[PDB]
Write a protein that binds this ligand. Structure first.
Ligand SMILES: C=C(NCc1c(COP(=O)(O)O)cnc(C)c1O)C(=O)O
Ligand SMILES: C=C(NCc1c(COP(=O)(O)O)cnc(C)c1O)C(=O)O
Lengths: 471, 470
């Protein structure tokens, strides 16, 4: 039905939470999982992260105790998502936002907090928590040097775990009908794991709670698990710290699973590909930890995994195959990159141009001919396409179909220069280039053309498909 | 309460729709609007767009008529969001996806449909709909040349408007309790406007329905409104075409509002800044059209605006201030860029360095940490700059030295490069302070240079303390 959203909401803050639990049957069937892998889609909140909750939560507490008045400044050390949630709360309730975040975090989080009118101070990646150059220490300095400022300090604020204990875990309980056998959850500030594990073990003591910690952090128990990569920088954002936060109750968690960058990102892309959840990398870490932890579970048993972040914050980072190839991360089991590598391989456009049959007789023009002059060439030379080129060096492609249709449409005058109706989006290639690169380039450009300034022809996706039909 | 999500969902397709309606009181107060500007947050669907619905919808129809079997290929010309929704449906129900979209559309849509295992063929921007190089014609060719392929053709499929008539408009009706006075909605394929306007006028005939069409399209009535910029390419994605789609019933819409790129993008950023809805550019166009159309309305009256897309698809495009400055679009009334322009102005780091002291020491980036602590203790400085031979390495603080030596990351005989801060931004004295602030948005330190004589380092606290002196 429609219970929580059946009316109109006063602000975006009322749209935080109430995320849907989805059964990842496709991903489990891919990875060979007997139990039901339930996913709590926290990335479907208004701000696209679970931390929205605590943000709102902390503000509410700060307002229910009168500790916060309009016009004040809010300061918060964050990996980016708590900053986004608090920035939403401030843009709604009229507070000023100053976010202190490490340079390791993505640029999308910074851009979104900038759109929310928040000042952004960045701290070095390799800094320890004791440092004055840590995000927490810089936030403390901003408190000390600025008036009417407040640090809500999600690492020690009781609201962070208390609201995960109050609403989120109760949501999971109501959605799983109490039958929860394993809960796999990443460990950042540790508030979400603490609260969820407590409420679930209180209303279902038989549930195992598994914490996910990146290879590089010291949050796992025992230290025999953290010493694979001690204090090694990692790319996954949100989970793991160089100290145990005040809100993290490591006694409430049963197991610990160590997950590296490669597994986290490949599993995040597998989540996107197999389920269709536009989710973050920390979520890939959590899901890989869950695939390791719930392996011994049987069918009927339900393992709840949080998907904290949305792909929005890492849209340039790991959704782009460019970045994960540069960082040497396995793309995916089934991906477009691997499909192109298998189908095309090392075949080059020399091979396609020779197998198809062409003698580089692609007529050029100086890109400022009148359309009547060029139609004489189109109709008399028996060619359909032409390539327009300037002096200062490529302009584009032109088809007689577009000529006729734009002349009828009122965009192509008979005395107009040919540059006005040519296709201006192109991708330059050269015969030694592989078909995998032209396949990647066709994802962004309609045509791929090759190149004394002697271009040999144009290649589109139908050409590659018809080549694949010959193989 | 908890009605729709109180259980577990079988697939992502079950999380489509059921978006919340939020009152944009902040944005209305900013623009001076008396009536209640309600926003249907369609970007909060699972796929982050309203088109998710029709995608799912069409598949269901294609499956309820037995027209679709597992392993088949689905082909669809789209501006990107219907492609995303259909790719979600295909990755869930086991169909192959081929999307045909113009090159003008953002790269985020392409990357996301790639993550969903969809083949992507791009078409030229300047092509007309009649062209074989149009997205629709290319999709038709892919149908003709590929076996087991289907085109659901959201421009003519009845599911596209029928489901907006069935669920979305009924959602709006149940959320507004029938009291809807104006409905402002963008016109792309026209399915959403057709369906929503029909269902709302059926359950509330007094409601005015306003269509939003970008300057460049021919969907507005009459053509006295389209002739400002006829067939001019525009940056807003999703709305407007060079022909009236089959599902668009232009008789069901009352008014038409022309919205350009600049207004659309500046109002989308205003939506993000004032309300906090991470929304798309087409939504900025729709909200600007609504601000123009519902101006004569009074308080109590409710004007419903759709926010079709999320910022996700335009994350590099218009959330980045770089691209809207490069495309000459007004940033916002109140923005961080304008705030830095007012606070800093044309002040350069020459002015700050002179108001505030010269040539903090350097090291060759391979000193032992014991040698560098001896240098710091003898030189009484706190920070140092590490530099290589082939040309900058970073900054180093004695605090990090002590804490990493105690933390087990800094060996007494280790090279100083291992503990230095490797993220830096290079500047030079003629640079302005607003630009160093923009660089400080992405780098912790901003250091200056001309010989390699490094005049010093500047952080955000330095700019704040300078602003305290001014
Ligand atoms: C530490 C922060 N986020 C925690 C986080 C986590 C861990 O959630 P915790 O509430 O810190 O336990 C997982 N995934 C992502 C993307 C996260 O951002 C922050 O936003 O400052
Ligand atoms: C035409 C497509 N989108 C329509 C659209 C619209 C218009 O919605 P229609 O249902 O097509 O009328 C508004 N905003 C955005 C971001 C859109 O993508 C498409 O995804 O192929």
């Amino acid at each position: 039905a429609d219970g929580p959203y059946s009316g109109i909401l006063d602000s975006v803050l009322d749209a935080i939470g109430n995320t849907p639990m989805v059964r990842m049957k496709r991903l489990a069937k891919v990875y060979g999982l007997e139990c039901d892998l339930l996913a709590k889609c926290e990335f479907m909140s208004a701000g696209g992260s679970v931390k929205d909750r605590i943000g709102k939560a902390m503000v509410e507490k700060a307002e229910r105790e009168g500790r916060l008045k309009a016009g004040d400044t809010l300061i918060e050390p964050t990996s980016g998502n708590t900053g986004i949630g608090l920035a939403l709360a401030a843009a709604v309730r009229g507070y000023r936002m100053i976010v202190t975040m490490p340079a390791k975090m993505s640029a999308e989080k910074s851009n979104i907090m900038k759109c929310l009118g928040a000042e952004i101070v960045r701290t070095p990646t390799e800094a320890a928590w004791n440092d004055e150059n840590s995000h927490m220490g810089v936030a403390a300095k901003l408190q000390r040097e600025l008036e009417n400022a407040h640090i809500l300090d999600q690492y020690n604020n009781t609201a962070n775990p208390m609201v995960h204990y109050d609403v989120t875990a109760e949501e999971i309980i109501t959605q799983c009908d109490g039958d929860i056998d394993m809960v796999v959850i990443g460990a950042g500030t540790g508030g979400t794991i603490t609260g969820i594990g407590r409420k679930i073990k209180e209303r279902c003591p038989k549930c195992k709670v598994v914490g996910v910690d990146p290879k590089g952090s010291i949050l796992a128990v025992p230290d025999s698990l953290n010493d694979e990569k001690r204090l090694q920088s990692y790319e996954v954002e949100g989970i793991g710290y160089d100290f145990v936060p005040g809100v993290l109750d490591r006694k409430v968690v049963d197991e610990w699973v160590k997950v590296g960058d490669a597994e986290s990102f490949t599993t995040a892309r597998a989540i996107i590909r197999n389920e269709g959840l536009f989710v973050g990398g920390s979520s890939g870490a959590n899901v890989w930890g869950a695939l390791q932890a719930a392996r011994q579970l049987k069918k009927g048993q339900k393992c709840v995994v949080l998907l904290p972040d949305s792909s929005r914050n890492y849209m340039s980072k790991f959704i782009s195959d460019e970045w994960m190839a540069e960082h040497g991360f396995a793309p995916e089991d089934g991906a477009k990159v691997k499909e192109r590598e298998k189908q095309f391989g090392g075949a080059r456009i020399r091979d396609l141009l020779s197998e198809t049959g062409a003698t580089s007789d692609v007529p050029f023009v100086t890109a400022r001919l009148s359309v009547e002059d060029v139609i004489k060439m189109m109709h008399e030379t028996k060619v359909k396409e032409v390539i327009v080129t300037e002096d200062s060096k490529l302009v584009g492609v032109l088809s007689e179909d577009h000529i006729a249709h734009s002349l009828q449409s009122g965009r192509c005058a008979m005395q107009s220069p040919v540059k006005d109706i040519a296709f201006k989006k192109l991708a330059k290639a050269l015969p030694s280039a592989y078909l995998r690169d032209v396949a990647k380039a066709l994802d962004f450009s309609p045509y791929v053309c090759v190149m004394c300034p002697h271009f040999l022809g144009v290649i589109t996706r139908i050409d590659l498909l018809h080549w694949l039909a010959t193989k």
